[PDB]
Amino acid sequence: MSMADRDGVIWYDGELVQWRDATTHVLTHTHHYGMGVFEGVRAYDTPQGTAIFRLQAHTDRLFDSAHIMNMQIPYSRDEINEATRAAVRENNLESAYIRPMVFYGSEGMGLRASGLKVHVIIAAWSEALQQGIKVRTSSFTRHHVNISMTRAKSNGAYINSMLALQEAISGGADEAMMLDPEGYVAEGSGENIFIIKDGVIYTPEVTACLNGITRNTILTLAAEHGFKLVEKRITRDEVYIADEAFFTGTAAEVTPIREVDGRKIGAGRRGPVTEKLQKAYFDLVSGKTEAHAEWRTLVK
Amino acid sequence: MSMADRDGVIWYDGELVQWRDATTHVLTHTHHYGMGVFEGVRAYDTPQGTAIFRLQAHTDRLFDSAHIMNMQIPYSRDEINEATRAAVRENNLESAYIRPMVFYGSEGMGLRASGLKVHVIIAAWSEALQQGIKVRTSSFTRHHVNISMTRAKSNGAYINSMLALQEAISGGADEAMMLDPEGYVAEGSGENIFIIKDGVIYTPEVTACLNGITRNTILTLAAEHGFKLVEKRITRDEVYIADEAFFTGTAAEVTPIREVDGRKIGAGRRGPVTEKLQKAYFDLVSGKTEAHAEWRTLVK
Amino acid sequence: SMADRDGVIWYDGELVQWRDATTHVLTHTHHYGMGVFEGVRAYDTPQGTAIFRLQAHTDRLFDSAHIMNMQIPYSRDEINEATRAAVRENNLESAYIRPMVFYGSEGMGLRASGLKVHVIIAAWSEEALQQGIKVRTSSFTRHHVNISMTRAKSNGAYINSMLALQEAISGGADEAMMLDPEGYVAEGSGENIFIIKDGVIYTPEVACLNGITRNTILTLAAEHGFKLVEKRITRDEVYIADEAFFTGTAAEVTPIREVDGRKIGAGRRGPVTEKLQKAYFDLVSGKTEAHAEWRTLVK
Amino acid sequence: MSMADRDGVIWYDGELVQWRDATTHVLTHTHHYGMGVFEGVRAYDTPQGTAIFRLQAHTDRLFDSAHIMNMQIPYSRDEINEATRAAVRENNLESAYIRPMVFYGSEGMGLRGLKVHVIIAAWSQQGIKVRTSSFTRHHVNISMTRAKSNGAYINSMLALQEAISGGADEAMMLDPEGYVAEGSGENIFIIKDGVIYTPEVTACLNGITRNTILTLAAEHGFKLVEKRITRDEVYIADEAFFTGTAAEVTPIREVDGRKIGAGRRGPVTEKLQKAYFDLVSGKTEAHAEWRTLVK
Amino acid sequence: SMADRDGVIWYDGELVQWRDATTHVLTHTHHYGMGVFEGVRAYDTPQGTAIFRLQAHTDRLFDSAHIMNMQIPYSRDEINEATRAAVRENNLESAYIRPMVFYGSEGMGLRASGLKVHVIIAAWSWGEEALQQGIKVRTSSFTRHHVNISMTRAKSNGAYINSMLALQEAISGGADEAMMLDPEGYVAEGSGENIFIIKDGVIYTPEVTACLNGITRNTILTLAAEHGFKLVEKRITRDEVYIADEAFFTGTAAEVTPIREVDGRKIGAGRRGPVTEKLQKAYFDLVSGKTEAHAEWRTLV
Amino acid sequence: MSMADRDGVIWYDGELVQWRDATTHVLTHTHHYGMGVFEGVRAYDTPQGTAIFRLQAHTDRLFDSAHIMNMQIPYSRDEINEATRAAVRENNLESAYIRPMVFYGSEGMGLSGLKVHVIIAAWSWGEEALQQGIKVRTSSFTRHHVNISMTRAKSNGAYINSMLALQEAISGGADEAMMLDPEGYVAEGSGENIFIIKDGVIYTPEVTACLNGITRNTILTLAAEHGFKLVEKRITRDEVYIADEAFFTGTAAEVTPIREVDGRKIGAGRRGPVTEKLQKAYFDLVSGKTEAHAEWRTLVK
């Protein structure tokens, strides 16, 4: 079992190459120093066929992340949008996770970015949402907005998420809750966080936490459903006494939270607002409703 | 021009594979999330032959960095020590830079480290030292000791070093001076920093900076040459009014600093203490001296 | 003495005599501060003695216990009824009420395993309100949101408040202004802080306690057509404000005439402060039938 | 099972009161606001008899802590020392943990005429698992870190309870800067290449047990360094242990799932643990000033 | 030279000759930085030379003196009339005005007891390619002022050492201006200007916390609302500025100066953006009287 | 009563000028932006004559401060040393406080083409507070941040924070303030370095965010010469509360004992034994009663 050994094609520098041929040299610069940007995109089976959810937003963020790191993607947004569709279409996938990733090649081994060639790959492949997960606050502090570029989804910056996730798992939990350098709640290991108190939705301001696309989708869905939503600084004990809490992310969708640091969240099961938003988001991404058709890009 | 199209061998998981055949899949976990550890080792031409300078300290630190990241190196320290010498000998190198690197394989794409295979790679290949360099203080804050593991030499953590080095170069300088989150001088982008005032050597405490092996080596040489050395917190303007300043690193060796942020350092020239320590370090690594033979391991 | 009084104290389900409400000297909360409490007021209304926002104080008491992982052995309706009994059975026309939850004297370690949860409720019975008070910014930094649970009203957390208040008093002032770890204005020693500048009300965003009296002022400010903005405030921003005042359960609405020697506006209670102070007293005294749910008759 | 329903006496404002009768009113000021200071002292059985270890240092620190909180103890240091000796003697304790505690009475209920009460109560592995606390240790300008105050232990209770719920035994505290500060209630030490490293007394406790280890390390020829320590510097240390009055020397074999050294009690930890025990038990006549006979 | 020139300067209730507007070298504010000042512009309008937002600059001047416990020995009406006098008496068509409140040379200690307060108002006549093509900005390695170390709401004299250090750094790095970050790492302001960005048609500016409540900033908020632009005050990171569609500085002396590059990252297309051009044109039409609105903001001289 | 209407001379840009003639234009750049460096120097009455204490260290720190601020002093150290002695000699001062000050002139007005001017003024020099102890209140203003202001340079505009803190300590009933760094640890007084004694050992904050005071450096020398153990480390405010002794060091404050901090009595509330010996040693040194360290006393005539 391996992520490298499987059938299909991977979009690699403009061409569709076989899956096991999509390799890079062991002295690849991003492999050793972390300078790279990537995306996480999902394709869902809809009544209209396989559709990618908010492809343009993920492609724009990819270019934004590369622009932050001074990495010139040798392609336009149209080609990357088309190549991301091709990554799912040319594999005949009914539903997939998509990993567009921009990295520096194996041209040089120094810290200077000059001389390094920019490579782009796009790989696509096929109770947590029900009752709720267990969360433990991480002892590792979340990224500092002047140490790592928090608006960029960069490869090397995910060590902190991995350390925190391993700590949460070794502590008996399913996910970690990250605090910013100021001590306020920021996000999960790879998800944004929302809480509900007295029918009002609260979520941390986009300061140190990543401007999640699933987060933005729930902000739009909440307004359309008439929910009052407040962006403000949230403390860890404010999460303890919330009626509801859930995570948002491309991979996690809307995942309810039932316990943080041993504190039961409300009644300890998926709350009414969480279920309404979770259902609305799933119907949106799966094409169960004609609403927001501009957010669904058919792959074929 | 490329770092992959090369003639030679690279130590790849217990086997000496051809340089062009030392590849990994493009969905390598460390490639996407930066979770990995590496070292930077130099080999010098001594009167006794090609020797690796302080091989034991670099292998010990490599295992420390892996131990910090909960990465299990599937080889003993002796096996890594023997394989490091093999990367220099089997390539017929008179003087070499060695890059041992430990990374997670292309087994999974989730943030959980479970199921990931640990691979080990050891690749080896062949005026500023005498003049001194221009330095500019980085606007990017150095790593935070509770966000990144500052004692580990991890791959993904060097995004901050590349951002800083590019800023320094775009500003017309040669290197950046990093400040910790408290505003005190920490290190260079890839080197440790030292200053001299009234014949006393000062260097930042091993706090947010990497415990450099060249740093620790200079501590030994400074004591052998009768220089009082004090480890304390240093401010940027204390560097401005120092009599001397220099950088230490495996690649940088002993590099004098003639100017910081436009402020000339002393006489704007390699001062007496820096030159004596620089010659003492070069005589040590090239075997021109006699003592510390335990720090020079023959490669053949 | 606060122990030698005539009356009753609601103690673990029953009304005991005031001097009989004792606890052992090795009580866990007494040695480690792990406990939560509330400050509630009862006012005389045309309908009789009524507790102001009893439900909000009881809900916050349970929230503070939930934060500290303390299981209150009573439901919210029992605590609500007990709080009314603390005022009624003491024959109080207007009262301050102190519900408090603490760990008993079953152990002496830092672990909470085996500790019994006890609940007590004790209820007992002008120029500052009109002329304003002197405030000196505290040299003690206010609580850190990840060091202490700032949303919980915990016993041991008030050491910081006592240090700041005594510092302000020895400095010739009446109250202290707390700054958060980042240097922004947080609150007073035991009150929230508001400022007025060009007819707009500004208050720090919630390292400060989400005060119930602060919440009523938001409601009263909107009812009286006042624009209110929640944002980070600096100490010098207070110096140049037109008005400033504190808000708390025990202090109600206390104007601020001077901060750090800087005169605030005209050096006395301002217009907006007067109307909010008037609106708050009219609300708690039942002078207006509005927000009748916020006045629970003690009966 | 309760800490109140016990036999014995408790020193309570100058006199010896029966254990069950040593009570205070439920509106005690320290109970509601945390304004109080305390000490943890141990008595050990020595060949000369039951002896309190460093009674003078704990009593001095108790008056220091009170002084920090502007609390005037209504007794001199000699009276407190003698009362501490009596708390062990009059209970017929061969070895005891002693809890002197100073607190404000139930005179007022405001935040500003409070009476100061004093009580003194006395009663009778290869390494532990440690998890770093997600709670930050006390800030040196928010709470008085040199004073051993009652209300400041909420942070310790939250961290210890977090470590236990996570499957560990003790917590490791980080200061607001992210550097290793201490354990839940104990100082922390690490050993790397025969050298002892302990966090510089920043947000630290200035522990008396820590101060004795400095002396015992120097007498056993161990170089000791006080500096800032990071959490991952603990991961790669050869040894690690906690020091406290009630914990003495507790070895640390694992921090955040990282095995410390060989995962067992190390040589330096063993030598310092035996030296501390031989010191407090009076095995040798060394540091006799640090042992005060109870009788 | 700013001293050897003809003209008059308002000096403590009297108009003295420009070369005679002197103070002793042991002046307290000169040595310890305790003083407050303003930056005011006058423009040519169809009604004549008019000061832009004279009331807002005088009010803030008194606020800054109040923060520093400095008593201005004059009323706001007298300072308004003196600011107009510094422009009218000098026969200036368009000028920059420097009202400055400082402590005299009464004592040399750090205590303010005994120091007399002086008020000076000087006005003198007034880069155009940068105004239309954008400037190069480099983030400052010097951290912006801390809200509990210096009084950031006051426009104080000594607090501008930090601005000078950062401007010198940016210039030595090849750029025209510095971008300042607060102690927490978020974007605060330029060296002497407030900063704005545009992303998907929405204007973003740092919340008034560690930066100065700029009057030009307050004017742009009004001009943005009148043009239907959604404006959001929030914390901004340096890399959020990298990916912004537009960016520009605001200040009395800088007007609306677009930003084309930050830390080597091209800002959008690398030139003045559409939203910036509309606000810049609106600001010039406002201060020069091309529009009739906001007659309060143009005080004829 | 004023610091300008006095008889005597002031060294002003290479020449001595009459005291009342030592003026600068009111648009002086340092006057408006605080960018300038200065020193505080003392001349004492010694058996060999009026002598400046550590003239070289104060002149070297002035050039260090100007080097940090990128200010080019148009004069050399030898000229400044000679001018500093002239400022005392030519005024016939038996003892004096000297204020060497480097500042930008009135050439420009933006944040270039600025001329550097130098002035050195000297004037003749609380005794009950010198032998009994002062009251100290911890300042609510945070001390300077090592990356916001240049804490090793003695710059003009940076002393706003000292004035804000000193006024607070006085309005609270005290004589001096105790400053805490942005991390909460003890840094210094408003303009003095702070020392504490506990069990016969001297503790003082490490040269971190506080000023590397020359008087502090002399005490480290004198403490070593008296066999005292001295430790540099991070000190909390409550560590000062429980110290046996505490005092301030500075050029103007010399050695000032501290009897009370935040209402906490320091030890016995009077000048401790260690403070008295170090105060005696410092006064004997600067006044020439001890002939040791002859290079630290530079005769004026």
User: How far, rounded to the nearest angstrom, does the alpha carbon of residue D132 sit from its chain's CA centroid?
Assistant: 20
SS3 letters across chain F: CCCCCCCCEEEECCEEEEHHHCEEECCCHHHHHCCEEECCEEEEEECCEEEEECHHHHHHHHHHHHHHCCCCCCCCHHHHHHHHHHHHHCCCCCCEEEEEEEEECCCCCCCCCCCEEEEEEEEECCCHHHHHCEEEEEEEEECCCCCCCCCCCCECHHHHHHHHHHHHHHHCCCCEEEEECCCCCEEEECCCEEEEEECCEEEECCCCCCCCCHHHHHHHHHHHHCCCEEEECCCCHHHHHCCCEEEEEECCCEEEEEEEECCEECCCCCCCHHHHHHHHHHHHHHCCCCCCCHHHEEECC
Distance from CA of D277 to the nearest CA of B (A): 33
Q: Are residues D76 and D144 in the same domain?
A: no
Report the C-alpha gap between F236 and C255 in whole angstroms: 34
HSE (CB half, 13 Å, CA atoms) of E121? Answer: 27
Is residue A153 part of the annotated active site? The answer reads yes
Residue D290 lies in a domain: no
Beta strands in B160-243 (DSSP E): 175-179, 185-188, 192-197, 200-203, 229-231
Phi, psi of D274 (to 5 degrees): -70, -35
CA distances from F204 to A160, C6, C107, F216, F247 (A): 38, 54, 42, 9, 10
Distance from CA of E155 to the nearest CA of A (A): 27
Indicate the helix (H) or strand (E) that contains C90. none
**What residues are paired with B38 via a beta bridge?**
B101
Give me the catalytic one of A117, A153, A197, A264: A153
**What residues are paired with C256 via a beta bridge?**
C133
Residue F298 lies in a domain: no
A198 CB contacts (<8 Å, ≥6 apart)?
A: A243
Q: What resolution in angstrom units was achieved for this structure?
A: 2.1
Residue B294 lies in a domain: no
CA distances from F203 to A194, B229, F228, F240 (A): 49, 21, 11, 10
Instruction: Please give the residue of chain A at the shortest CA–CA distance from E237.
Output: A145
Asked if residue D65 lies in contact with residue D73, where contact means CB atoms within 8 angstroms, the answer is no
Chains in touch with D (≥3 Cβ pairs < 8 A): A, B, C, F
Report the C-alpha gap between A232 and C145 in whole angstroms: 14
List chain F residues with CB under 8 Å of B200. none
Q: Are residues C169 and C238 in the same domain?
A: yes
Count of structural domains, chain E: 2
Q: Are residues A120 and A230 in the same domain?
A: no
Asked if residue A93 lies in contact with residue A43, where contact means CB atoms within 8 angstroms, the answer is yes
HSE (CB half, 13 Å, CA atoms) of B264? Answer: 9
Q: Are residues F84 and F147 in the same domain?
A: no
Give me the catalytic one of B117, B134, B153, B288: B153
Instruction: Give which of E137, E141, E262 to mutate to test B binding, by max B Cβ within 10 Å.
Output: E141
Return the structure tokens found at D38: 């305390």
The secondary structure of chain A as a DSSP string is --SSS-SSEEEETTEEEEGGG-EEETT-HHHHH--EEE--EEEEEETTEEEEETHHHHHHHHHHHHHHTT---SS-HHHHHHHHHHHHHTTT-SSEEEEEEEEE-SS--SS--TTPPEEEEEEEE--TTTT-EEEEE-SSPPPPTTTS-TTS-BSGGGHHHHHHHHHHHHTT-SEEEEE-TTSSEEEESSSEEEEEETTEEEEE-SSSS---HHHHHHHHHHHHTT--EEEE-B-HHHHHT-SEEEEEETTTEEEEEEEETTEE-TTSS--HHHHHHHHHHHHHHTTSSSTTGGGEEE--
Asked if residue D77 lies in contact with residue D59, where contact means CB atoms within 8 angstroms, the answer is yes
User: How far, rounded to the nearest angstrom, does the alpha carbon of residue D124 sit from its chain's CA centroid?
Assistant: 16
For tokens 């110290």, name the residue: F243
Q: Are residues B110 and B240 in the same domain?
A: no
Q: For chain E, what's the residue count?
A: 301
Return the structure tokens found at B181: 């989150």
Helix axes B77-89, B55-68, angle to 10 degrees: 130
Instruction: Please give the residue of chain D at the shortest CA–CA distance from A169.
Output: D166
Classify B181 as helix, strand or coil: coil
List chain D residues with CB under 8 Å of B207. 179, 228, 230
Classify E221 as helix, strand or coil: helix
Q: Are residues B144 and B278 in the same domain?
A: yes
Chains in touch with E (≥3 Cβ pairs < 8 A): A, B, C, F
Identify the CATH number of the domain in which residue D269 sits: 3.20.10.10
Identify the CATH number of the domain in which residue B102 sits: 3.30.470.10
Q: What is the residue type of C266?
A: A
List chain F residues with CB under 8 Å of B233. 206, 208
List chain A residues with CB under 8 Å of D178. 141
Q: State whether residue E143 sits within 8 Å of chain B by CB.
A: yes
Report the C-alpha gap between B158 and B136 in whole angstroms: 18
Contact E185 A67 (CB under 8 A): no
Residues of the domain holding C35: 6-125
In chain D, count H helices and then E strands.
7, 18
Asked if residue C201 lies in contact with residue C221, where contact means CB atoms within 8 angstroms, the answer is yes
Q: Are residues A111 and A223 in the same domain?
A: no
Q: Are residues C15 and C133 in the same domain?
A: no
Asked if residue B2 lies in contact with residue A125, where contact means CB atoms within 8 angstroms, the answer is no
Listed residues E64, E95, E127: the one ending a domain: E127
Q: What is the residue type of E216?
A: T
Residue ranges in chain E assigned as alpha helix (H): 28-32, 54-67, 76-88, 130-133, 161-172, 215-226, 238-242, 274-287
Contact F182 E146 (CB under 8 A): yes
List chain B residues with CB under 8 Å of D227. 205-206, 231
**What residues are paired with D180 via a beta bridge?**
D174
Residues of F184-214 as b/e, b for ≥16 C-beta within 10 angstroms? Answer: bbbbbbbbbbbbbbbeeebbbbebbbbbbbb
D236 DSSP assignment: T
Residues of E forming the active site: 155
Return the structure tokens found at B147: 């966000």
Residue A2 lies in a domain: no
Classify C274 as helix, strand or coil: helix
Chains in touch with B (≥3 Cβ pairs < 8 A): A, D, E, F
Q: What is the residue type of F79?
A: E
Residues after which chain E has a gap (C–N > 2.5 Å): 126
Residue C295 lies in a domain: no
Residues of C73-90 as b/e, b for ≥16 C-beta within 10 angstroms? Answer: ebeeeebbbbbbbbbbeb
Listed residues A87, A102, A126: the one ending a domain: A126
Phi, psi of A104 (to 5 degrees): -85, 140
Q: Which of D227, D231, D257 sits opposite B146 (nearest CB)?
A: D231
Classify D21 as helix, strand or coil: helix
F92 CB contacts (<8 Å, ≥6 apart)?
A: none
Residue C185 lies in a domain: yes
List chain E residues with CB under 8 Å of B170. 173-174, 263-264
Report the C-alpha gap between D68 and B189 in whole angstroms: 44
Listed residues B126, B145, B169: the one ending a domain: B126
Q: Are residues C134 and C281 in the same domain?
A: yes
Distance from CA of D171 to the nearest CA of A (A): 11
Residue A297 lies in a domain: no
Q: Are residues B194 and B246 in the same domain?
A: yes
- Experimental technique: X-ray
Dmax (CA) of chain A: 58
Q: Which of D116, D115, D59 is nearest to D87 (CA)?
A: D59
Report the C-alpha gap between E42 and E58 in whole angstroms: 14
Kindly report the number of other CB atoms within 10 A of residue A300's CB atom.
10
Asked if residue A178 lies in contact with residue A189, where contact means CB atoms within 8 angstroms, the answer is yes
Asked if residue F247 lies in contact with residue F255, where contact means CB atoms within 8 angstroms, the answer is yes
Q: Which of B31, C5, B237 is nearest to A22 (CA)?
A: B31
Return the structure tokens found at B115: 């199921």
Q: For chain A, what's the residue count?
A: 300
Q: Are residues C90 and C138 in the same domain?
A: no
Return the structure tokens found at C160: 């910081």
For tokens 């700029």, name the residue: E214
Q: Are residues D51 and D135 in the same domain?
A: no
Classify C7 as helix, strand or coil: coil
Q: What angle do CA D265, D271, D275 make, to 5 degrees?
A: 130
Q: What is the residue type of F94?
A: E
Instruction: Please give the residue of chain A at the shortest CA–CA distance from B189.
Output: A111
Cβ-Cβ pairs closer than 8 A, B with E, add up to: 38
List chain A residues with CB under 8 Å of C205. 232-233
**What residues are paired with A123 via a beta bridge?**
A99
Q: State whether residue A279 sits within 8 Å of chain B by CB.
A: no
Residue B28 lies in a domain: yes
Contact E141 B261 (CB under 8 A): yes
* End-to-end Cα spacing for chain A: 30
Return the structure tokens found at D49: 């008899």
